Structures are given as C-alpha cells and as structure tokens.
C-alpha cells in the first residue's frame, strides 16, 4: 500500500503518493522530513532547478501500488544536481553524502530499474 505525501518540501512535486521505508532508510515520513531538512539550504539556493524533485524521489519515492518498487529520479537528473550544486557546497565543503552518490540511481532506459524525469 501507499500513503499520501506528508513531507512539506515534497508537496506539489508531481506525484501523489509514497511508500515507506524510503531509499534513505527512514521508516516513516516524519523522520524522513527531518533528515531531508539538511538539504533545505540547497533547495533554496536553486543551484539546480530539479534538486527538490530528485531529493523527493528518494526521501518520498513515488507509489501507485501497481509498480512493486520505489521509483527514483533518473541518473540523468542526479549528476546535473551534483555538478551544478558542487561549487557552493565546495565553499561550505560538506559534500554530497554517499547516501546520495549518483551512480546508484538507474540510468534512463536501464535494463533492470525504472526512473522518473521532472515536469
């Protein structure tokens, strides 16, 4: 089963439902939102316009019930987010955690996993 999106930063994100646990290990959306708040400065800085959608793809993956796997954003989306947001993170130096290392996300039209792009 699925649950409506309750994380404030993932409202009006493109899809309506999610399933716990997410891809970050959290087992409810409350605890998911609290650890998502660590990246709130980067969403606000807008170094990439799709960073909020990419992050929500992992902290609140899409759920429809038919599809049996949580669905993240494409590899294509994450690389651009870490590329274009790296300069400002370099300044503060806290680097993209391996929790978010882009090479875990499936490429678009990848043999074993499905992905999403942003509206």
């Amino acid at each position, epitope marked *: 089963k699925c649950q409506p999106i309750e994380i404030p*930063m993932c409202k009006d994100i493109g899809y309506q439902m999610t399933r716990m646990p997410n891809l970050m290990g959290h087992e409810n959306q409350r605890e998911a939102a*609290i650890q998502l*708040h*660590e990246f*709130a*400065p980067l*969403v*606000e*800085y*807008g170094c990439h316009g799709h960073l909020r959608f990419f992050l929500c793809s992992l902290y609140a993956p899409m759920c429809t019930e038919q599809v049996s796997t949580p669905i993240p954003a494409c590899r294509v989306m994450c690389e651009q987010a870490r590329l274009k947001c790296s300069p400002i993170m370099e300044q503060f130096n806290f680097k993209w955690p391996d929790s978010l290392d882009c090479r875990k996300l499936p490429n678009k039209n990848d043999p074993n996993y499905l992905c999403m792009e942003a509206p």
Partner: antibody
Amino acid sequence: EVQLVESGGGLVQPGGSLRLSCAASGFPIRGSSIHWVRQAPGKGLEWVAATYGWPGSITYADSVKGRFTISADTSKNTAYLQMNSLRAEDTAVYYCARRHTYPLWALDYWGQGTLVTVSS
Amino acid sequence: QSPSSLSASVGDRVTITCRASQSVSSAVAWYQQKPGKAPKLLIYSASSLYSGVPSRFSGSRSGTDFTLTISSLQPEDFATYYCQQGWPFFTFGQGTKVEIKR
C-alpha cells in the same frame, strides 16, 4: 497562531554581557529556523545570527562573530542569544523571527523586539 | 546604513532596486516596516506575493538586481522597504523610506 516574544533587553556597560530570550508559541523551536535581526535607532535592519533548525549550521554575521552565541531549550520552547563583550555599536532593538522554509524562505513572523542599550 | 529617502505621490509607480551579485539565489524577501513596528513580509522568492498583500505589489529579479514595484502608490504604502538575501548571506540591503509629496 505563531508568536514570538523577546525578553532580556536592558542596559549594559561596554564589555558586559546580556542574554536575550525568544519565547515561541504555535510552533516547536527544535527543528526550526530562528533569525536574530537588530535595528540601531534611525538605522536599517541588520541580520545578526541564525539557526537552520538542527544544532549545526548556526551562522553569525561578521559584526558579531566570536561574541554572540545562539542556544535553545526545547522544554521552555525558547531560543537564546548570548551577547558578550558588547560595544556601544551593538545598541539596537533586537528582533527574533521564524524563517518559514519551503516554499517561503522568508521571515514571516517577528517579535515586537526588545531594546538593548550598551553604554557607560 | 541609514535608510534612503524617496518622495512620491499617491498613484505614482515606484520600483525599488536591491543590488546584489549573480552568485546569490532568488530566495529574496521584501519587507515593509513602519515607525515603531516590526517588519512585515511582502514578497518571498523574489516574485511571490505573500498572503494578504495587495496586488499592486510585485517582485522580479533581473541579473544581479532584485526589484520591488508598487504599481499605484497608496497612502498605506508610505513606509520603509528592505530586501533580504537568502542562504547563506541572509543580509538586508539599505532600506528605502517612501515619504509622501505635499
């Protein structure tokens, strides 16, 4: 609904210390972004210090870095601004304010301020 | 520093400029402050009108410049206006105090 009330203002001599209180009602202090913004009389607003919610990411302005320190105590649901080695330049009305995150990213609620006077 | 002054009449169109750098995000807020009161939020994210703010208020970013425009200045609008930067500067610009021509 959201409301912030400042306390702890008053008079202090140069080099002295003061601690302001920012009492929150309507939202939890823990996991919330609070900013301190001061206004010297007849002058403009000056952002001073801020938390982004978690213990880290506490930021200060250069004019106060080293001398001012942010705290909180979730039981009382109030944040604190410890001010040390005060100079007369720090004479100002001190505001605390909640920074609404997504989708605002703005100080949507302010206290009424408390006056801090540093003088001999 | 001290706020800049601008003299205007009711019904005038005013555009206040907040000069920054292009290395700053568009999470810029605009505030309105009247004597002896706390600032009030007008515009967030450079262009989004806050709730209960009249439609004659407007925000836009162009390069390094953020602007506030009042399309038809009304008597309640004469006050001081401040822009604020987003993370990680959070710095306020110089205020613009709009006073009424008489």
